[PDB]
């Protein structure tokens, strides 16, 4: 009944089974590595049926040490992860093995990592704003409670810092459960997040699942699904408000691409797997909220080659209600959080939802920044004095608005030393209305840099 | 008059720069298409 | 020789049931089924369905239509005997259906009037008729400068979050007035095909249509991102099948595809998983044929075939506003006209963000009512002159009087073309609005107030001088008596208009 | 003797034949689709020999409904198109099947669409000019008899009206015939062209061959060759000068590329077929003048990405002898045929081929129009009053010159009643010589609109 | 990997290590060479997936 | 190569030849076609790696022979059709490094 | 500096700085020309053109092309000449004087010729 | 001359030496112009260039 490893190629292993016992797709198989230094039980996930009783599987652990002909046993079920209130306050890996307390979840209810997304009947659009305290997010790209939020950004533009800041701003003032999915990110960031949550006494309400980038491709593919399974248990089996932070969801597709060619799939677009949209949709549509039970999902997205036209970000943009597009240009200019005010968007920025007052200020800021972006070409070469008087005054307003969109974030105290700030939404609207109307045009530009609100703006202006 | 002459020269120089940059952009677009097709077909040949 | 004869007999020797020899990533290979036909619908043991896209001498490569994980090697595959077909009828109005015609809204089953194959040929050249009647989108920009006529293919092409779905939903909503009249010759039906959109976005589109009352004449063919590549590939053809059933019966249909970029991606995935040779951007050699076969179904049938028509509004999402990419190039060449929606205009406050200019409708004047054609004729040239003179906004003082007049006129026409979301304008209101601008009646209004002045004057005419609108709708042209009355109403209203800056208008 | 279908991969079909009866390349085979809804007689063009008596073919109709093992009957000849005076006045597809009167033409003589270009010794060594009778063409962009002419434009610039004009002129002046090869032709545009030609009563002088886009790439690739076969029959057999339109040639190239991808060939350059130049030469080099009779061609060329260095136009333009660019600006000024005098160009416009006086007059007209275009900015922004006396005189000359390039086209007769004009080239040269020397710069501008030469100019001036 | 192992031995023994990799770009090229010589189908930029 | 052989026969017989090629750009494209149909992986601009060879092997046989071999000569005038004055393109640079 | 010396390294770094600034100003030089730069940058660009042209030399292998015999410039003279160029001691000479000149003495000769 | 002409296309005025250079170049370029299919023997070429 048991299988037999026939071919091993990196993270992909082919297993030959008897005729009447070929495992189903997405089932979990167990092999054994007996080499002393790397001994372990290796979990394989069936990905293809090759025929003649051969299945082809992704390895959830490194295949180093695996020997041809080694027995492979079928679990009879897909990779299952613990669920329940017990998972809160603990750290799990993609397989559901607890890290900070090994063997903790072995007696909890176990749910299959693979499951269909909720039917279209249960879906209902979400149109409630999630005030977070950041000027740029609250003004230009209001976040949706129960909706899907993303933090796009090239390599190293502050996605982790911003997602940690938003954890601090949402979860720390939120009574429901929270789930974090460290999909293929830096382990130091995950450890710092775990320590911070323990110190802030928010860990007890947070379940952390890490599949960080040291793990092979299979773990990076399936850690997102494991954390998300915990999330849907908290959604459907407890009717409780849930936050699902994923950092970084692109790593799911990237891990899929790493094993794409070894599985026999022809490459597509720039080296990506042909099934990019299918797989990422299967994963994303599970994150959606259903009426009466909300998952506020916040997933960072990596932009390979710092190119927003790359297939992965382009296909991810369609699964999101709010999108904060970080950029290296803004980061180099020194405007941290490095949000791109123009490329970023939110589906709740509608005068029928946020109010005409908020919408008018947001659109005026966008118009001013777009005109400044257009004028930057002339200014760099022709000069500032050759512009129209109206355009010159608009350029001043635009520089001040760009620098006011910056904010001293709580999680960025290490970047700047100074403590963070929380700017109420109404104060943001008033401040940016005034900026667009010029009541702060007489202050120097630096007065607006890394300053959290109007009172702090006045203090900095008096200091300068 | 000097401004007229200088800005006519600047417009001509900008037009020439636009032509050169359009040629460069077309060359890079064609190169990107060819390189992407090369990668795709190289993956295809290895099956 | 006799060996060849024996082989001939053996080959000529061939219910038919096959066996799954290979499965993975949404593709299953089915040994057997010697009499299976290309694109036949196969049924698998678990109720799963597949489409036999590849037929080799060894196995049938079938794309599995969702619910793929239930497929195993050795499962018995049974052939349906018929090519891909979908139910069609009047029961699909107000329903949300997956590409196979099965409802997903959760309401009752759909009473299908007939079944149509997804691959029935498009109307031939001799079965068609010149596109000669408008399809009022309610978007001033489109209906004034890139008109869509019934039977036309108008491609809404633009980057992400630029206003494409908004334009199409406004087009669908604007057909409510034509629906309520009950005349099948004015009554326009709509099919909104969502490909790869997240389920909540399809639900939001449904909410927008239902709150606007459009869902009593609109069908949504939903292939969400969750659904397999097979559904994202077939959904446009399901929508086209429903629209074709309505069209050949004499009805007028509006088909929105959102986005054909996601159909091309699904077909690319299916083809690559099927080991078909890839082309540019990894697309198979028949992606252009895919989209052409999709869009050439849209047509206006000759009166010998009922006179029905199907108008397509294919939406395609460009990347970095690169309209030279493979799918954008194919669809631009296929379609009759293009609405290029740009993000730069969107941020500048132009809404919908149509780049008037590069955007063009090849049908042109034949798709406009006489009133719009007369009033909106000068709009394009005025906007062109404004875009050429905009560099002189800084030095207007040195411009000639005529150039200053052109600049001021354009700065107000651009505002005139702005339009809020989900607020389509009936054709008569558009005629009056463009009359306000092209005739110079906005020259006395501040550029900051052109939008509100338009809205208030249109409301005033609707409430008190509705004769103008009735005349335009019944006659299709703005008569001289009506023109004089409208000018008088404009002048009377301008006396009672409070400008934003407190100024006055004469 | 008949074969069997063994592989169906979209448009591509593999057919196995007995060892001794494999069809030769480019043979046309017939295969039945018996399914009721999609019943068809597919025409498969043999494209490759794969060995073992298998031949790989491109289906000219959709292969949906095709069944493995279905009989395939070889026709023994390439795709054969009907030829003869009977093809005039009708519309055909790439396979010779009549689209408006089905079954028509099956009894005509059938010619293979694959024919070698004229023998080397049969080519005319001197490029003879085609006196169209249109002032603008015959003066500034002289067409080359037996040559190819680019036709840039679009909707609303009178491209269809110019096509009607050329049909009329070839039919009456040269006693010839026209063949319209609608490669990648929009079915709506095909029907519009058909009804417009019928209304103009020029369809009787034109044979239409539409390779519609809805058809697979094979027909879009072979429709140009089918139309050129009809043109070659009218040239070599009927002894008529033929004008072969192709709309659009880039779509012929694109169909060739798509077919190359379908057959498995590795793409070249920007993804085009490796044999791009070979196919383009096989198509264009058949468009030439031999034995005193010529197949002139007006080809609409789409330049992708507005890039003239892309291999498609780059290979097409190696063959084009002239370029005619219709512009919106000229069309809106009331000038028909709407040819842009400056953007359009011709390679025969050298003093060696055309007369020295012709070249001098054309260059003077070009200089005046270029100066007028340069002063257009000043005129529009500052007004004509700013121009100097010399500049005003030049503007007066140029307005009348550009309006005289307009002509009362033959195709306009149906819309206006007055007959179309055919100015002899000598008269055009003399009239434009006079106009540039200013002998008519005192007449009203309205006098030069839509008039047939010099005597008509005098008569209309006397009328005004 | 050899340098990382030599450093890790000290790291897990309570000592502080500083690893310099001049150049990780040349490691990627070498891995590309090995993979292409093993006939792994490459990804983008001809690099291994 | 047919022209080069015809010229070389005279060159080694002590006679002077002048060989023109209108245009070697179209030979490179042709050889690209053959090499791609043979499925040889392409290089820059979809050309095979040995495209340079194709031309050098060709243009390197145009030589001024020593008096020991008769003193004949063959002068090459290859024609390259650049695209928008892109003298920095692949084939132009190859043939400029050969010539 | 530990190998070629302090003076050589300093002059080389200053020349590289001037040429890098000239390259950075190319974006404006192409459109608007030298006229619109700041005065410090104007002087920098003038001596940058002179430096760029002085790095040119008449090589012996170039004789077969130009006829003019090649020239050799020892290291000490090169360092002195480029130090003077960077300090601006030759900003009054025409740019044409520095083409293919190879030396301070021969530079003065060509300047007198012009 | 090819660069002196570009400089003079926008220079307000030219020195006598620059004028001489421009006037000589505008004639050398015209001299090098040559009709098609009209090759000149080397003697005629040297005389013309003289
Ligand atoms: N005419 C309009 N006026 C104001 N806001 C508009 C208008 N059209 C669209 N918007 C807003 O633009 C944003 C995106 O609109 P929409 O949903 O139409 O985008 P889209 O182009 O279909 O993009 P995608 O489907 O890729 O997200 C939404 O906030 C919508 O409210
Ligand atoms: Mg959309």
Strand partners for A12: A9, A58
Q: At A285, list the tokens.
A: 């549509």
Same domain, C350 and C418: no
Does residue A62 form part of some domain?
Answer: yes
Q: What is the DSSP letter of F40?
A: P
Does residue G83 form part of some domain?
Answer: yes
Same domain, A114 and A256: yes
Nearest CA-CA distance, residue D424 and chain C, Å: 35
Maximum separation of any 2 CA atoms in chain A, in Å: 83
Which CATH number is G31's domain given? 1.10.1140.10
Output phi, psi for A151, to 5 deg.
Answer: -125, 85
Strand A3-9 and strand A71-78: the pairing is: antiparallel
Same domain, D56 and D70: yes
Q: At D405, list the tokens.
A: 């390039």
Same domain, D103 and D38: no
Closest of D15, D71, D56 to residue C12, by C-alpha:
D71
Strand C188-195 and strand C85-88: the pairing is: unpaired
Residue C463 CB coordination number (10 Å): 8
| Number of domains chain G contains | 1
Which CATH number is A191's domain given? 3.40.50.300
Strand A128-130 and strand A143-145: the pairing is: antiparallel
C124·D187 Cβ contact <8 A: yes
User: Which residue's CA lies nearest to atom 23 of ligand 1?
Assistant: C161
Boundary of a domain, candidates A27, A62, A81: A81
Question: Could you identify the residue written with the tokens 């978007």?
Answer: C139
Instruction: Identify the helix (H) or strand (E) that includes residue H19.
Output: helix H16-32
DSSP 3-state assignment of F65? coil
Of all ligands present, the nearest one to the C-alpha of A316 is 1
The sign of the torsion formed by the CA atoms of B30, B34, B39, B40 equals positive
Q: In whole angstroms, how far apart are CA A279 and each of A222, A285, C200?
A: 12, 10, 18
Give residue A37's Cα distance to chain centre: 35
Does residue A71 form part of some domain?
Answer: yes
Give residue A362's Cα distance to chain centre: 25
Please note each residue after which chain G is broken, C-to-N distance over 2.5 A, or write none: none
- HSE-CB for D342 with a 13 A CA cutoff: 14
By residue range, what is the domain housing residue C400? 372-496
- Any idea what the Cα angle at residue H24 is, between residues H19 and H26, rounded to 5°? 95
Q: Name the active-site residue from D4, D40, D172, D186.
A: D186
**C318 CB near ligand 1 (under 6 Å):** no
Strand partners for A107: none
Which ligand 1 atom sits closest to the C-alpha of C158?
Answer: 21
- Spatial distance between the Cα atoms of D450 and D438, rounded to a whole number of angstroms: 19
G27·A382 Cβ contact <8 A: no
Same domain, A316 and A388: no
- Spatial distance between the Cα atoms of D248 and D182, rounded to a whole number of angstroms: 7
Residue D381 CB coordination number (10 Å): 19
F33·D274 Cβ contact <8 A: yes
| DSSP H helical ranges for A288-388 | 311-316, 328-333, 356-381
B42·F41 Cβ contact <8 A: yes
Is the CB of residue A71 less than 8 Å from the CB of residue A3? Answer: yes
For ligand 2, the distance from its centroid to the CA atom of residue C144, given in whole angstroms, is 23
The b-or-e profile of B4-20 (16+ CB within 10 A means b, else e) is: eeeeebbeeeeeeeeee
Nearest CA-CA distance, residue E27 and chain B, Å: 20
Same domain, A128 and A51: no
By residue range, what is the domain housing residue G36? 6-113
| Number of domains chain C contains | 3
- Spatial distance between the Cα atoms of C471 and D258, rounded to a whole number of angstroms: 53
Close Cβ partners of D103 (under 8 Å, ≥ 6 residues apart): none
Same domain, A96 and A144: yes
Query: Would an 8 Å CB–CB cutoff place H50 in contact with chain B?
Result: no
Same domain, A296 and A373: no
For ligand 1, the distance from its centroid to the CA atom of residue C422, given in whole angstroms, is 10
Is position D157 annotated in a ligand binding site? Answer: yes
Same domain, A214 and A320: yes
Q: Name the active-site residue from D131, D185, D215, D258.
A: D185
- Spatial distance between the Cα atoms of G10 and D321, rounded to a whole number of angstroms: 62
Touching A: B residues 6-45, CB under 8 Å? 36, 39-40, 43-44
Is the CB of residue D241 less than 8 Å from the CB of residue D293? Answer: yes
Q: Name the active-site residue from C128, C351, C362, C473.
A: C362
CB contacts < 8 A (B, C) = 14
Question: Could you identify the residue written with the tokens 């015209």?
Answer: H30
Query: Would an 8 Å CB–CB cutoff place F38 in contact with chain B?
Result: no
D383·C53 Cβ contact <8 A: no
Same domain, C91 and C75: no
Does residue D93 form part of some domain?
Answer: yes
- Spatial distance between the Cα atoms of D229 and D78, rounded to a whole number of angstroms: 12
Strand partners for D144: D129
Method for structure elucidation: cryo-EM
A271·B47 Cβ contact <8 A: no
Nearest CA-CA distance, residue B36 and chain A, Å: 6
Strand D143-144 and strand A177-183: the pairing is: unpaired
Task: Catalogue the long-range contacts made by D14-19 (C-beta closer than 8 Å, 24 or more residues apart).
Answer: D14/D50, D14/D54, D14/D55, D14/D56, D14/D57, D15/D44, D15/D46, D15/D54, D15/D55, D15/D57, D15/D72, D16/D52, D16/D53, D16/D54, D17/D53, D17/D54, D17/D55, D17/D72, D17/D74, D18/C4, D18/D53, D19/C4, D19/D53
Q: In whole angstroms, how far apart are CA C229 and each of C25, C226, D65?
A: 10, 9, 21
For ligand 1, the distance from its centroid to the CA atom of residue D177, given in whole angstroms, is 53
C281·B44 Cβ contact <8 A: no
DSSP 3-state assignment of D184? strand
Q: At D331, list the tokens.
A: 């069309």
Does residue C241 form part of some domain?
Answer: yes
Nearest CA-CA distance, residue D196 and chain C, Å: 10
Close Cβ partners of C117 (under 8 Å, ≥ 6 residues apart): C82, C83, C84, C85, C241, D37, D38
Close Cβ partners of G114 (under 8 Å, ≥ 6 residues apart): G94, G96, G97
Chain C touches chain E, with at least 3 Cβ pairs below 8 Å, answer no
Q: Name the active-site residue from A148, A159, A397, A400.
A: A159
Closest of A225, A298, A220, A181 to residue A62, by C-alpha:
A220
Resolution (A): 2.8
Close Cβ partners of A46 (under 8 Å, ≥ 6 residues apart): A23, A24, A25, A26, A27, A29, A55, A56, A57
Is the CB of residue D423 less than 8 Å from the CB of residue D135? Answer: yes
Question: Could you identify the residue written with the tokens 């021969």?
Answer: G106
Peptide bond into D31 cis (omega under 30): no
Is the CB of residue C74 less than 8 Å from the CB of residue C83? Answer: no
Close Cβ partners of D72 (under 8 Å, ≥ 6 residues apart): D2, D3, D4, D5, D15, D17, D29, D30, D31, D44
Does residue C505 form part of some domain?
Answer: no
Boundary of a domain, candidates C351, C371, C391: C371
- Spatial distance between the Cα atoms of D220 and D248, rounded to a whole number of angstroms: 10
Across the interface, of E39, E40, E44, the residue whose CB is closest to B39 is E44
Does residue A381 form part of some domain?
Answer: yes
For ligand 2, the distance from its centroid to the CA atom of residue A345, given in whole angstroms, is 13
DSSP 3-state assignment of C41? strand
Same domain, D155 and D178: yes
Peptide bond into C126 cis (omega under 30): no
CB contacts < 8 A (A, B) = 17
Q: At D46, list the tokens.
A: 């043999």
**A178 CB near ligand 1 (under 6 Å):** no
Nearest CA-CA distance, residue D401 and chain B, Å: 27
Does D116 participate in catalysis according to the annotation? no
Does residue A351 form part of some domain?
Answer: no
User: Which residue's CA lies nearest to atom 8 of ligand 1?
Assistant: C163
Closest of C306, C333, C132, C248 to residue D195, by C-alpha:
C132
Is position A153 annotated in a ligand binding site? Answer: yes
- Spatial distance between the Cα atoms of C60 and C28, rounded to a whole number of angstroms: 8
Strand C27-31 and strand D3-9: the pairing is: unpaired
Boundary of a domain, candidates C86, C115, C146: C86
Which regions of C17-130 does DSSP assign to beta strands (E)? 17-24, 27-31, 40-43, 49-55, 59-64, 76-83, 85-88, 96-97, 114-117
Q: At F80, list the tokens.
A: 């390259």
Across the interface, of F42, F45, F84, the residue whose CB is closest to B23 is F84
Of all ligands present, the nearest one to the C-alpha of C161 is 1
User: Which residue's CA lies nearest to atom 13 of ligand 1?
Assistant: C161
Which ligand 1 atom sits closest to the C-alpha of C317?
Answer: 26
Of all ligands present, the nearest one to the C-alpha of C192 is 2
Boundary of a domain, candidates C86, C117, C141: C86
Boundary of a domain, candidates A58, A81, A104: A81
Residue G27's closest chain B neighbor by CA? B17
- Spatial distance between the Cα atoms of A205 and A174, rounded to a whole number of angstroms: 10
Output phi, psi for C449, to 5 deg.
Answer: -120, 5
Output phi, psi for C444, to 5 deg.
Answer: -90, -5
- Spatial distance between the Cα atoms of C213 and A383, rounded to a whole number of angstroms: 54
Is the CB of residue C48 less than 8 Å from the CB of residue C70? Answer: yes
- Spatial distance between the Cα atoms of D21 and D81, rounded to a whole number of angstroms: 24
Strand partners for C189: C253
Boundary of a domain, candidates A33, A59, A81: A81
- Spatial distance between the Cα atoms of D335 and D322, rounded to a whole number of angstroms: 20
Q: Give the per-residue SS3 of D205-274.
A: HEEEEEEECCCCHHHHHHHHHHHHHHHHHHHHCCCCCEEEEEECHHHHHHHHHHHHHHCCCCCECCCECC
Which CATH number is C230's domain given? 3.40.50.300
Does residue C503 form part of some domain?
Answer: no
Is the CB of residue D152 less than 8 Å from the CB of residue D269? Answer: no
State the best of A50, A259, A264, A266 to mutate against chain B, taking most chain B CBs within 10 Å: A266
F42·D275 Cβ contact <8 A: no
Nearest CA-CA distance, residue B43 and chain H, Å: 51
The b-or-e profile of A231-255 (16+ CB within 10 A means b, else e) is: bbbbbeeeeebbbbbbbbbbbbbbb
Residues of E in contact with A257 (CB under 8 A): 43, 49
Does residue D351 form part of some domain?
Answer: no
Does residue D47 form part of some domain?
Answer: yes
- Spatial distance between the Cα atoms of C219 and C227, rounded to a whole number of angstroms: 18
Strand A206-211 and strand A345-346: the pairing is: unpaired
A120·C161 Cβ contact <8 A: no
Which ligand 1 atom sits closest to the C-alpha of C352?
Answer: 1
Instruction: Identify the helix (H) or strand (E) that includes residue C202.
Output: helix C199-211
Same domain, D293 and D150: yes
Close Cβ partners of G29 (under 8 Å, ≥ 6 residues apart): G37, G45
- Spatial distance between the Cα atoms of A77 and A79, rounded to a whole number of angstroms: 7
Instruction: Identify the helix (H) or strand (E) that includes residue A54.
Output: strand A54-59
Is the CB of residue C214 less than 8 Å from the CB of residue C206? Answer: no
**C165 CB near ligand 1 (under 6 Å):** yes
Which ligand 1 atom sits closest to the C-alpha of C160?
Answer: 26
Give all chains having 3 or more CB-to-CB distances under 8 Å with chain A: B, C, E, G
Same domain, C65 and C150: no
Residue E49's closest chain A neighbor by CA? A258
Residues with CB under 5 A from ligand 2 (ion): C 165
Same domain, C161 and C273: yes
- Burial status of residue D98 (CB atoms within 10 A of its CB: 0-12, 13-18, 19 or more): middle
Across the interface, of C24, C268, C319, the residue whose CB is closest to A48 is C24
Strand partners for D298: D149, D245
The sign of the torsion formed by the CA atoms of A85, A91, A97, A99 equals negative
Does residue C388 form part of some domain?
Answer: yes
Output phi, psi for C478, to 5 deg.
Answer: -90, 100
- Spatial distance between the Cα atoms of D249 and D227, rounded to a whole number of angstroms: 12
Output phi, psi for A348, to 5 deg.
Answer: -95, 0
CA dihedral C172, C174, C176, C178 (to 10 degrees): -110
Same domain, A39 and A126: no
For ligand 2, the distance from its centroid to the CA atom of residue A356, given in whole angstroms, is 23
Query: Would an 8 Å CB–CB cutoff place C409 in contact with chain D?
Result: no
CA dihedral D282, D286, D287, D293 (to 10 degrees): 180
Same domain, D340 and D371: no
F32·D268 Cβ contact <8 A: yes
Is the CB of residue C380 less than 8 Å from the CB of residue C166? Answer: no
- Burial status of residue C342 (CB atoms within 10 A of its CB: 0-12, 13-18, 19 or more): buried
Same domain, C401 and C390: yes
DSSP 3-state assignment of C403? helix
Same domain, C303 and C363: yes
């Amino acid at each position: 009944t048991a299988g037999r490893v026939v071919r091993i190629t990196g993270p992909v292993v082919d297993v030959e089974f008897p005729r009447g016992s070929v495992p189903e797709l997405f089932n979990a198989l167990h092999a054994e590595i007996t080499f002393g230094a790397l001994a372990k039980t290796l979990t394989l996930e069936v990905a293809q049926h090759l025929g003649d009783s051969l299945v082809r599987c992704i390895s959830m652990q490194p295949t180093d040490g695996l020997v041809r002909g080694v027995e492979v046993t079928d679990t009879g079920a897909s990779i299952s992860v613990p669920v329940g209130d017990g998972v809160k306050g603990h750290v799990f890996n993609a397989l559901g093995d607890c890290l900070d307390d090994p063997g903790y979840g072995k007696d909890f209810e176990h749910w299959s990592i693979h499951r269909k997304p909720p039917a279209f009947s249960d879906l209902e659009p979400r149109t409630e704003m999630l005030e977070t305290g950041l000027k740029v997010v609250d003004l230009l790209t209001p976040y949706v409670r129960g909706g899907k939020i993303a933090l796009f950004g090239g390599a190293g533009v502050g996605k982790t810092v911003l997602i940690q800041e938003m954890i601090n701003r949402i979860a720390r003032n939120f009574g429901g459960t929270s789930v974090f999915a460290g999909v293929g990110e830096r382990t130091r960031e995950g450890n710092d997040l775990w320590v911070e949550l323990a110190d802030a006494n928010v860990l007890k309400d947070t379940a952390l699942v890490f599949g960080q980038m040291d793990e092979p491709p299979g773990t990076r593919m399936r850690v997102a699904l494991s954390a998300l399974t915990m999330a849907e248990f908290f959604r459907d089996e407890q009717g409780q408000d849930v936050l699902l932070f994923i950092d970084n969801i692109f790593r799911f597709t990237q891990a899929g691409s790493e094993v794409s060619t070894l599985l026999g799939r022809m490459p597509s677009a720039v080296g990506y797997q042909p099934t990019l949209a299918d797989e990422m949709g299967e994963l994303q549509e599970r994150i959606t909220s259903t009426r009466g039970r909300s998952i506020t999902s916040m997933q960072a997205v990596y932009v390979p080659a710092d190119d927003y036209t790359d297939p992965a970000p382009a296909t991810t943009f369609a699964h999101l209600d709010a999108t904060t597009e970080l950029s290296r240009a803004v980061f180099s200019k020194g405007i941290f959080p490095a949000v791109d005010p123009l490329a970023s968007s939110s589906t709740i920025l509608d005068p029928a939802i946020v109010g005409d007052e908020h919408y008018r200020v947001a659109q005026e800021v966008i118009r001013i920044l777009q005109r400044y972006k257009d004028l930057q070409d002339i200014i760099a070469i022709l000069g500032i004095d050759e512009l129209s008087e109206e355009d010159k005054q608009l350029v001043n307003r635009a520089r001040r608005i760009e620098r006011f969109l910056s904010q001293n974030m709580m999680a960025a105290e290490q970047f700047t030393g100074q403590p963070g700030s929380t700017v109420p939404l109404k104060e943001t609207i008033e401040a940016f209305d005034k900026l667009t109307k010029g009541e702060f045009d007489h202050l120097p530009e630096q007065a607006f840099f890394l300053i959290g609100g109007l009172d702090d703006l006045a203090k900095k202006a008096e200091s300068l | 008059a000097s401004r007229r002459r200088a800005m006519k020269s600047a417009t001509d120089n900008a037009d020439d720069l636009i032509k050169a940059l359009t040629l460069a952009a077309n060359r890079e677009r064609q190169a990107q298409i060819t390189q992407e097709i090369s990668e795709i077909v190289g993956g295809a040949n290895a099956l | 020789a006799d060996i060849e004869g024996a082989i001939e007999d053996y080959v000529s020797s061939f219910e038919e049931i096959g066996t799954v020899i290979d499965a993975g990533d949404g593709i299953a290979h089915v040994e057997g089924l010697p009499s299976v036909m290309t694109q036949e619908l196969l049924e698998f043991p678990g109720g799963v369905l597949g489409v036999a896209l590849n037929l080799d001498e060894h196995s049938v490569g079938a794309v599995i239509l969702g619910e793929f994980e239930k497929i195993e090697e050795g499962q018995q595959v049974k052939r349906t005997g018929e090519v891909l077909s979908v139910p069609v009828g009047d029961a699909f109005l107000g329903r949300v259906v997956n590409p196979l015609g099965q409802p997903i809204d959760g309401q009752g089953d759909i009473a299908a009037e007939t079944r149509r194959a997804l691959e029935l040929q498009a109307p031939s050249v001799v079965q068609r008729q010149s596109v000669s009647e408008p399809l009022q989108t309610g978007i001033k920009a489109i209906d004034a400068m890139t008109p869509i006529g019934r039977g036309q293919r108008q491609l809404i092409i633009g980057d992400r979050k630029t206003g494409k779905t908004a334009v199409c939903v406004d087009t669908i909503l604007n057909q409510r007035e034509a629906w309520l009249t009950g005349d099948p010759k004015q009554q326009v039906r709509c099919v909104y095909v969502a490909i790869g959109q997240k389920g909540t976005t399809i639900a939001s589109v449904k909410r927008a249509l239902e709150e606007g009352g459009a869902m009593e004449y609109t069908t949504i063919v939903a292939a969400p991102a969750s659904d397999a590549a097979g559904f994202k590939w077939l959904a446009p053809y399901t929508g086209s099948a429903i629209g074709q059933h309505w069209m050949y019966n004499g009805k007028h249909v509006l088909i929105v595809f959102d986005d054909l970029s996601k159909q091309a991606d699904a077909y690319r995935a299916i083809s690559l998983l099927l080991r078909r040779p890839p082309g540019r951007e990894a697309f198979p050699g028949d992606v252009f044929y895919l989209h052409s076969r999709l869009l050439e179904r849209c047509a206006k049938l000759s009166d010998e075939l009922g006179g029905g028509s199907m108008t397509g509004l294919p939406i395609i999402e460009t990347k970095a506003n690169d309209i030279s990419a493979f799918i954008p190039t194919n669809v631009i060449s296929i379609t009759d006209g293009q609405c290029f929606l740009e993000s730069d205009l969107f941020n500048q406050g132009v809404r919908p963000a149509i780049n008037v200019g590069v955007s063009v409708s090849r049908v042109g004047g034949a798709a406009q009512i006489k009133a719009m054609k007369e009033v909106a004729g000068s709009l394009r040239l005025d906007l062109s002159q404004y875009r050429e003179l905009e560099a002189f906004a800084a030095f207007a003082s040195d411009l000639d009087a005529a150039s200053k007049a052109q600049l001021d006129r354009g700065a107000r026409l651009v505002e005139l073309l702005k339009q809020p979301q989900y607020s389509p304008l009936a054709v008569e209101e558009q005629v009056v609005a463009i009359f306000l601008g092209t005739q110079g009646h906005l020259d006395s209004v501040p550029v900051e107030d052109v939008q509100r002045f338009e809205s208030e004057l249109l409301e005033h005419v609707k409430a008190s001088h509705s004769d103008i609108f009735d005349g335009i709708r019944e006659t299709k042209k703005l008569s001289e008596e009506a023109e004089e009355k409208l000018v008088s109403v404009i002048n009377e209203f301008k006396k009672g208009f409070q400008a934003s800056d407190g100024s006055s208008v004469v």
